[PDB]
Amino acid sequence: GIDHTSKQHKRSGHRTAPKSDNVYLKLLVKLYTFLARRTDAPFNKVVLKALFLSKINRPPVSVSRIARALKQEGAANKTVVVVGTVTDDARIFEFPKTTVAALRFTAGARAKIVKAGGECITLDQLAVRAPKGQNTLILRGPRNSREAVRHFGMGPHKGKAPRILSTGRKFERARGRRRSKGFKV
Amino acid sequence: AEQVAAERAARKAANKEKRAIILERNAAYQKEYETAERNIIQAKRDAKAAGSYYVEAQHKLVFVVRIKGINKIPPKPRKVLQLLRLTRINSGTFVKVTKATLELLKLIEPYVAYGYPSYSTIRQLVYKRGFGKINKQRVPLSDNAIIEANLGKYGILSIDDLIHEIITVGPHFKQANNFLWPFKLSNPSGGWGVPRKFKHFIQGGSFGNREEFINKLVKSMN
Amino acid sequence: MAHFKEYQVIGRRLPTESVPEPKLFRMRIFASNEVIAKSRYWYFLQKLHKVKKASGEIVSINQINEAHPTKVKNFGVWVRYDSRSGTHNMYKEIRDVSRVAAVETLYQDMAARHRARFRSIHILKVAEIEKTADVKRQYVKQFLTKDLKFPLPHRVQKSTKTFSYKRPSTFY
Amino acid sequence: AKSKNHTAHNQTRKAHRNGIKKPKTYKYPSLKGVDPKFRRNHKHALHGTAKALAAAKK
Amino acid sequence: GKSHGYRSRTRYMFQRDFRKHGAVHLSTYLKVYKVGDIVDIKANGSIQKGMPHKFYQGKTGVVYNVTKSSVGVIINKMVGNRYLEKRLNLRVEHIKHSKCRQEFLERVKANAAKRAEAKAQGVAVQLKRQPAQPRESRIVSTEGNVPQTLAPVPYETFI
Amino acid sequence: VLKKNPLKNKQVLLRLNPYAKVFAAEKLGSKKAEKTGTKPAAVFTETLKHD
RNA sequence: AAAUAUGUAAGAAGUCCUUGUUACUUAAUUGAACGUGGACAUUUGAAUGAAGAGCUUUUAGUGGGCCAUUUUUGGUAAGCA
RNA sequence: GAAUACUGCCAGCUGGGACUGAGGACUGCGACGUAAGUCAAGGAUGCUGGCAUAAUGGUUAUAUGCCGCCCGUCUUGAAACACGGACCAAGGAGUCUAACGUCUAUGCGAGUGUUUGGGUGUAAAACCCAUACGCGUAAUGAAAGUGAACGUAGGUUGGGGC
Ligand SMILES: [K+]
Ligand SMILES: [Mg+2]
Ligand SMILES: [Mg+2]
Ligand SMILES: [Mg+2]
Ligand SMILES: [Mg+2]
Ligand SMILES: [Mg+2]
Ligand SMILES: [Mg+2]
Ligand SMILES: [Mg+2]
Ligand SMILES: [Mg+2]
Ligand SMILES: [Mg+2]
Ligand SMILES: [Mg+2]
Ligand SMILES: [Mg+2]
């Protein structure tokens, strides 16, 4: 017998492969597995781990987010890397000439980036021209902006959104929500 | 001539000078042990001649063997056995003697047998059952290069250097001891010597402090 | 544990600034090994003084051998022991060649006749009786008569084999 | 038919199964329950010292 | 029925000490508490305002808020399987400074002094505390201290 | 692939610890000690024999 | 007035030296809290261990218990409660 | 003045027995040798014999030694003097639907959703499509209403990657 201080046969809890059957994604995973093994650059390891992520853990990254990231000093000539989708944004009216490498570009995002003088690039061409992740800039999208996150942690005084179908007066705005009707949360 | 011999000769020359370093260290450690023993003996003789008494230095090191199974242990001793890394019966660890550790042993006393190891016991234990904890894995030592790869920053280049860092509780004792995996000992070859183990050694049992008799017990256990 | 050795154990309180050089209390202990001898020394200093192992030190432990281990001696042994319903002093005498074996005899004797374990016995004193007529117990004094001699009738001989072919005798 | 009324038996083993955890203190704790006069001052002191820092750095 | 009021089972721990009743001495009120100070809670039974609950008797916490006559003390309370942050508003009658944190602050000053001297002379000043080490060898002289002691003693009635 | 114990297999015992050759070549495990004629003191002997 | 059990602390979110912010505070260029700059070196301030450490979502069964050592209530007691 | 007991050490030598032989070119650490090589040094080889078939082995029946209470169920507790079950075959129990939560996959993404319907067709398929409509891109208030940049869309502390 052994006095087990820890739970036995415990899986790491991390994805080691994409959950999908996309063969082109699996080819990208194979390429960045080779790069994350034969190169010591932590960029290839971070890109490889991001290639395993689910959809909610790969939020889209807008072109306005990319332009804001390019307003940083020393980052004008960098290569923006989005392991996921670059969506479009009409809120902006100027776009810098830059190189963006991403899994997917929406039609609007690709048009805006190309019209700005830049180029859209896949992660394999990213690997070819920047094998060690030279002057790259990895961007991620907002994960807690998801609508499901609003209801996480519901409870008294937590200030969270109830899981509700119909919204308005007569829908959970009474006893328990105001002092005049019983109490307030 | 694809450049194999040049680095092979560089490696053999490096290995030779490393073995010369280990040899000269081991010679100086042997003379250190020899004088440490002879001085104590001659000090006792001198004190007897002068009519006084020579009280020896209290032992800095103990070896602790968990002699009890894993069922029905109260939480406080269970935690202390986990902290001393005795998770299965007949496991053993070295402990530096301080007030904190002595209270730990005084608290797990009914489940362990401990005492003061000798140089022969430590040497045979490390040579025969010494495994290192390397990248969370239990690696048989079997080579000086492994110990130098994991303890080389502490100046411990060989198994003899590890043994000295255990027998004399050096500055890097904590790192060398934790690098050693908990020794997995067998049951004693001639038995425990008592009808019932779970009394104190003073009361004819097996647990507790049996200070110098731990050597004979551990030798039969490995 | 009954293979008793006799140790002298000299201990003292730990020296302090008020009282350097304490008084070196010394006892004679019968025990199988040095660990039990030291433990018995601290047990008796615990009971007889306000000294405990935490605030004390052992300055010497030495085994005492018999001066003449092949000379027959009459030993008077004063003991106190705890019976099942009280505490009692007794005086006994063991005719034997050494103090350690006399103590072995008394521990066996006290276990046989009074069901008193080593846990329950304190050896107050073991003393050589210098001359006869200071012996008081008839079971020892009867062995001191001049020209002592006695037969051993009814010899029972241990047999190496299961079966015998001779109807054995008990002559001797 | 009466049943058992109460016991704390097994409750500590359950509590220690996932451990008893300290509440993970942060730098800059919340100013909830602090004196409002102090909070009102501290807002202006922070505003002024950020103004001075930004003016110096430019 | 059962009774579980606010001050239940506080009969002895809200006593004043024997021959220590009456008014509070002014050194209680002349003590200065800052935010971050570590304090010990012990209710003075003669002041029934700002009194801590019976749970917090003997608890030690950190001051987060300082008001006119009271301090805000943060205490970690074990509720179920975790500790919950609890915030108390206690008058300074029921509050004293942690003397252990006073010696910790003095030790910090002493450690700085030792390192300051060692930066000039005597390097490797070895700041860390160490546990009680085993004793070294010694020579116990017998001259004038001849060992002399007797054996266990016989049983006597003493009644 | 297989743990070879020292204390046997003198090849492995020599792979580790190169001093073992000198230890064997000099019989350091059976070293004879220098004779010393330092007697115990009378107060020690009398204390030991004291009742 | 014990024993056992129990709170807290043992530093980098630290310490010290200057001088900055404020509508709070002081008689005050006094403090309070938060800072700029500077100094502290690898023992970053006891021991042992750490099997990875933190964090989140969501959902099952369960919500009759019983036994032993010790403490302990009712009861003559109980394989009683 | 010696010996011996006891306890301990040897990186002292050696005899008998038992179980195991995992891996499968080489690499390493070594040792003995002036080197060249050799070896018990990152896991067994060499030599020899018999049989080449029911001989070994498998299955099966039996015997012998030891062990083995009737399953399912409710229960703190079942072999129970608790209940269901004489036997066998076949049938026999978490399904589909409306709406929905978390998670995952896919498409497109400030949008998204063709299939109410129209067009067409090799005709309940496949293919093509307008306007709307749903959800989303704005919240808050009982409501009348009003409705999101002082600032490189702020400061501080961490923070992967660069
Ligand atoms: K009940
Ligand atoms: Mg045997
Ligand atoms: Mg009032
Ligand atoms: Mg139920
Ligand atoms: Mg049977
Ligand atoms: Mg059943
Ligand atoms: Mg029955
Ligand atoms: Mg029924
Ligand atoms: Mg029936
Ligand atoms: Mg039926
Ligand atoms: Mg069927
Ligand atoms: Mg069915």
UniProtKB/Swiss-Prot annotation, chain A:
Keywords: Cytoplasm, Isopeptide bond, Methylation, Ribonucleoprotein, Ribosomal protein, Ubl conjugation. One of its GO terms (cellular component) is cytosolic large ribosomal subunit. There is a cross-link at residue 115 (Glycyl lysine isopeptide (Lys-Gly) (interchain with G-Cter in ubiquitin)). GO terms for molecular function: RNA binding; structural constituent of ribosome. It comes from Saccharomyces cerevisiae (strain ATCC 204508 / S288c) (Baker's yeast). It comes from the Eukaryota. Belongs to the eukaryotic ribosomal protein eL18 family. InterPro entries: Ribosomal_eL18, Ribosomal_eL18/eL18-A/B/_CS, Ribosomal_uL15/eL18, Ribosomal_uL15/eL18_sf. Disulfide bonds: none annotated. The modification N6,N6,N6-trimethyllysine is found at residue 49. Component of the large ribosomal subunit (LSU). Mature yeast ribosomes consist of a small (40S) and a large (60S) subunit. The 40S small subunit contains 1 molecule of ribosomal RNA (18S rRNA) and 33 different proteins (encoded by 57 genes). The large 60S subunit contains 3 rRNA molecules (25S, 5.8S and 5S rRNA) and 46 different proteins (encoded by 81 genes). eL18 interacts with NAP1. GO terms for biological process: cytoplasmic translation. Its main location: cytoplasm. There are 2 genes for eL18 in yeast. It is found in: Cytoplasm. This is Large ribosomal subunit protein eL18A. Component of the ribosome, a large ribonucleoprotein complex responsible for the synthesis of proteins in the cell. The small ribosomal subunit (SSU) binds messenger RNAs (mRNAs) and translates the encoded message by selecting cognate aminoacyl-transfer RNA (tRNA) molecules. The large subunit (LSU) contains the ribosomal catalytic site termed the peptidyl transferase center (PTC), which catalyzes the formation of peptide bonds, thereby polymerizing the amino acids delivered by tRNAs into a polypeptide chain. The keyword Ubl conjugation applies.
Curated annotation (Swiss-Prot), chain B:
InterPro entries: Ribo_uL30_ferredoxin-like_sf (IPR036919), Ribosomal_uL30 (IPR039699), Ribosomal_uL30_CS (IPR018038), Ribosomal_uL30_euk (IPR005998), Ribosomal_uL30_euk_arc (IPR035808), Ribosomal_uL30_ferredoxin-like (IPR016082), Ribosomal_uL30_N_euk (IPR012988). Component of the large ribosomal subunit (LSU). Mature yeast ribosomes consist of a small (40S) and a large (60S) subunit. The 40S small subunit contains 1 molecule of ribosomal RNA (18S rRNA) and 33 different proteins (encoded by 57 genes). The large 60S subunit contains 3 rRNA molecules (25S, 5.8S and 5S rRNA) and 46 different proteins (encoded by 81 genes). Component of the ribosome, a large ribonucleoprotein complex responsible for the synthesis of proteins in the cell. The small ribosomal subunit (SSU) binds messenger RNAs (mRNAs) and translates the encoded message by selecting cognate aminoacyl-transfer RNA (tRNA) molecules. The large subunit (LSU) contains the ribosomal catalytic site termed the peptidyl transferase center (PTC), which catalyzes the formation of peptide bonds, thereby polymerizing the amino acids delivered by tRNAs into a polypeptide chain. This is Large ribosomal subunit protein uL30A. GO terms for molecular function: RNA binding; structural constituent of ribosome. Keywords: Cytoplasm, Ribonucleoprotein, Ribosomal protein. It comes from Saccharomyces cerevisiae (strain ATCC 204508 / S288c). It holds the Pfam family Ribosomal_L30. Signal peptide: none annotated. Its main location: cytoplasm. Present with 101000 molecules/cell in log phase SD medium. There are 2 genes for uL30 in yeast. Belongs to the universal ribosomal protein uL30 family. GO terms for cellular component: cytoplasm; cytosol; cytosolic large ribosomal subunit. The keyword Cytoplasm applies. NCBIfam families: uL30_euk (TIGR01310). One of its GO terms (biological process) is ribosomal large subunit biogenesis. The keyword Ribosomal protein applies. It is found in: Cytoplasm.
From Swiss-Prot, chain E:
There are 2 genes for eL21 in yeast. This is Large ribosomal subunit protein eL21A. Transmembrane segments: none annotated. One of its GO terms (molecular function) is structural constituent of ribosome. The lineage of its organism: Eukaryota, Fungi, Dikarya, Ascomycota, Saccharomycotina. It comes from Saccharomyces cerevisiae (strain ATCC 204508 / S288c). Disulfide bonds: none annotated. There is a cross-link at residue 31 (Glycyl lysine isopeptide (Lys-Gly) (interchain with G-Cter in ubiquitin)). It is found in: Cytoplasm. Component of the ribosome, a large ribonucleoprotein complex responsible for the synthesis of proteins in the cell. The small ribosomal subunit (SSU) binds messenger RNAs (mRNAs) and translates the encoded message by selecting cognate aminoacyl-transfer RNA (tRNA) molecules. The large subunit (LSU) contains the ribosomal catalytic site termed the peptidyl transferase center (PTC), which catalyzes the formation of peptide bonds, thereby polymerizing the amino acids delivered by tRNAs into a polypeptide chain. Component of the large ribosomal subunit (LSU). Mature yeast ribosomes consist of a small (40S) and a large (60S) subunit. The 40S small subunit contains 1 molecule of ribosomal RNA (18S rRNA) and 33 different proteins (encoded by 57 genes). The large 60S subunit contains 3 rRNA molecules (25S, 5.8S and 5S rRNA) and 46 different proteins (encoded by 81 genes). The keyword Ribosomal protein applies. The keyword Ribonucleoprotein applies. Belongs to the eukaryotic ribosomal protein eL21 family. One of its GO terms (biological process) is cytoplasmic translation. Keywords: Cytoplasm, Isopeptide bond, Ribonucleoprotein, Ribosomal protein, Ubl conjugation. Its main location: cytoplasm. InterPro entries: Ribosomal_eL21, Ribosomal_eL21_CS, Ribosomal_eL21_sf, Translation_prot_SH3-like_sf. GO terms for cellular component: cytosol; cytosolic large ribosomal subunit.
